[PDB]
Ligand binder design. Structure first.
Ligand SMILES: Cn1cc(-c2ccc(CNc3cc(-c4cnc5cc(OCCCN6CCCC6)ccn45)ncn3)cc2)cn1
Ligand SMILES: [Cl-]
Length: 277
């Protein structure tokens, strides 16, 4: 009770093993916007070698609470540790300021823009169906890893999944809310859990197997949208979605969060699909 408590990663001190000289960073083009830029890190991993990285930083007009928020994200990434399917922390510039968060660089960018570019050149260097099951499998693995560290993402979507060399997908994270990806309990009661992440993973699967279509097409976010979602309206199967994968989406979209599968259940379900190829 009083003697045993969860260890809040945002309350732990910043570990200076991540500290990197900011004069060894040369910023390039902006990757996204709290902007993220491409940069060359001189001597980051090897002393005599430059390395392309991504650097997250706040807008110059960010105030006191925004500055501490970026530090908390840094501490969470440090507490999570390295994993194959997340955009891994590589270093930070914290002395003096402004805080710079150095992470892995993924040359292909976000998965949503990637799928829309490969939309034509798709057949079940060509995007295929084996890639789509691999992508769905790797994202569930990363989310299972997050769930194992008592961390929920709260903005899982194709736009927050990056692609790098070797077709490795990595989970990342770039008030206004992503309504069409949110579980009903998040929209109506503002609660976020492991299960609401699973709901968003189901929406991600629909983006993936439709080659990047916007979810709920032709439906604006309005009174009719909320009414239909609450009454049980769900999207139908995407054009390129296997039957066993659509069965997963339906379970992720269960109105009862306790009936939704866990990411640990999802990974081994997709494992049996890949195995029986
Ligand atoms: C599990 N979990 C992870 C976090 C997490 C991790 C990391 C962070 C900060 N780091 C980043 C990094 C990048 C990034 C890396 N590589 C690219 C490459 C890009 O595109 C270039 C390709 C050009 N286009 C392609 C063709 C046309 C032009 C774009 C962005 N990125 N994006 C955002 N934040 C924050 C949170 C939180 N929970
Ligand atoms: Cl907890």
């Amino acid at each position: 009770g009083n003697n045993y408590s969860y260890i809040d990663p945002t309350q732990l001190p910043y570990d200076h093993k991540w500290e990197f000289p900011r004069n060894r960073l040369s910023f390039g083009k902006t990757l996204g916007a709290g902007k993220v830029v491409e940069a060359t890190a001189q001597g980051l991993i090897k002393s005599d070698a430059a390395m392309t990285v991504a650097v997250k930083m706040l807008k110059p007009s960010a105030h006191s609470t925004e500055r501490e928020a970026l530090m908390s994200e840094l501490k969470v990434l440090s507490y999570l540790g390295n994993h194959e399917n997340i955009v891994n922390l590589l270093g930070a510039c914290t002395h003096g300021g402004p805080t710079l968060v150095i992470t892995e660089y993924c040359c292909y960018g976000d998965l949503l823009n990637f799928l829309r570019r490969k939309r034509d050149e798709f057949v079940p260097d060509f995007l295929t169906l084996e890639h789509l099951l691999s992508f769905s499998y790797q994202v569930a693995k990363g989310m299972a890893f997050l769930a194992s560290k008592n961390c929920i993402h709260r903005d899982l979507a194709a736009r927050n999944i990056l692609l790098t060399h070797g077709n490795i997908t990595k989970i990342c994270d770039f008030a206004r809310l992503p309504v069409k990806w949110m579980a009903p309990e998040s929209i109506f009661n503002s609660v976020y859990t492991f299960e609401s992440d699973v709901w968003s993973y189901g929406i991600f699967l629909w983006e993936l197997f439709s080659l990047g279509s916007s979810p709920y097409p032709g439906m604006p976010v309005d009174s009719k949208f909320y009414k239909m979602i609450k009454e049980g309206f769900r999207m139908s199967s995407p054009e390129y979605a296997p039957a066993e994968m659509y069965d997963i989406m339906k379970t992720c979209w269960d109105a009862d969060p306790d009936k939704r599968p866990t990411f640990k259940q999802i990974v081994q379900d997709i494992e049996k699909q890949i195995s029986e190829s």
